């Protein structure tokens, strides 16, 4: 098993910590959802290849521009996250997160991930967003942003239901293995 490194980036409200927690436990916690994620090394077999995939969160480093880049050395794949219940989190992708990752992780594949997909059709979310003249992110808006930023691909998931979570990390492993 070859070792590869994954880092997840995105705004504080994108759900990156929850996504790493749910994948690493194969479960949405029933009693207590952790506030933080330390690290984890997942054993993943994708398309017949065995990989040890080290997982890292950047939560808590968003306001610290000299500490945050210390998370990037030797990254093999970036998950760049936004929440589907937050068009504001998608707007910060192209001119804040993307130029940073391209500078510190040149030529590393980026997968743009729309988190919290279960809220796209949630009535409470649609009501709260309508007060700011907004609506949940549409799948075409996510795909178009991924296309524009030069992402390897676009994927959606829900940490709450686990739908799409395994697929995201298996595809990140495939991207990390590409030359």
């Amino acid at each position: 098993a070859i070792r590869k490194k994954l880092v997840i980036v995105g705004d504080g409200a994108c759900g990156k910590t929850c996504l790493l927690i749910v994948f690493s436990k194969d479960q949405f916690p029933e009693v207590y959802v952790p506030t933080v994620f330390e690290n984890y090394v997942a054993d993943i077999e994708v398309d017949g290849k065995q990989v040890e995939l080290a997982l890292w969160d950047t939560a808590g480093q968003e306001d610290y521009d000299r500490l945050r880049p210390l998370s990037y050395p030797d990254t093999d794949v970036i998950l760049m996250c936004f929440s589907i219940d937050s068009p504001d989190s998608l707007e910060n992708i192209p001119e804040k997160w993307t130029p940073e990752v391209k500078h510190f992780c040149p030529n590393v594949p980026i997968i743009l991930v729309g988190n919290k997909k279960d809220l796209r059709n949630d009535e409470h979310t649609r009501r709260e967003l309508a007060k700011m003249k907004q609506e949940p992110v549409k799948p075409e808006e996510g795909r178009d942003m991924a296309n524009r930023i030069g992402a390897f691909g676009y994927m959606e998931c829900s940490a709450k239901t686990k739908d799409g979570v395994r697929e995201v990390f298996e595809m990140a492993t495939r991207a990390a293995l590409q030359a």
């Binding site: 933080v36 330390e38 808590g60 000299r66 210390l70 998370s71 030797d74």
Partner: protein, 245 residues
Amino acid sequence: SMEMDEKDFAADSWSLAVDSSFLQQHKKEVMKQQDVIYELIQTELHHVRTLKIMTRLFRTGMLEELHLEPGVVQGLFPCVDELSDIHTRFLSQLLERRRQALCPGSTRNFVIHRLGDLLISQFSGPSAEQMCKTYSEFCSRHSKALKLYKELYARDKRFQQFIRKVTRPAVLKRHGVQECILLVTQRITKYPLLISRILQHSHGIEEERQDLTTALGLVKELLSNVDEGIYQLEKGARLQEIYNR
């Protein structure tokens, strides 16, 4: 870590650590506050264990088995003794607050009602100055430590054999040399997240809400000072590269 503390923090939450008959005596808001305080202490125990792997297993093993050039082991593990002293003392205070709160006849049932004052003390005065000085030095030497490690692993046979030997056990799966360095750099930025969530469930006693608000401000002040005090050192750096952008 020592077995007594590992067992006290083995459960996924405070609500699963205490006896169910004790849990049932508390209101939901108290349970939510205690579950976050328990996560702060449990992750501090694991952070001190990361520093002990760096000092006792890696640093000591290299000094005892390998013939490295002088200044190489300090280059791989900058500031580790100072970081160990800071966090072992902080962990000792957190564990003493828990132990004093135990009910007589129990080694697991407790409620911590007064964490804020301990956090203000940790993140103010001389201990905050030492944390700022040590993390500004450690984080500025982070890139150099990773590059020195990579160079030795690729060129020195005895070094590669040593690393593969000491990192083979399953309990070290998340704790290779580079992984320990990044776990330590990321520790300081987990504190605001944990303190803010404890504060969210600490409104019942106004003195406690005020103390945690003061502690959160002190932790953010320390992080801002460390972040402004970092510039990566590089082996063979020329003065012209330093004074130019």
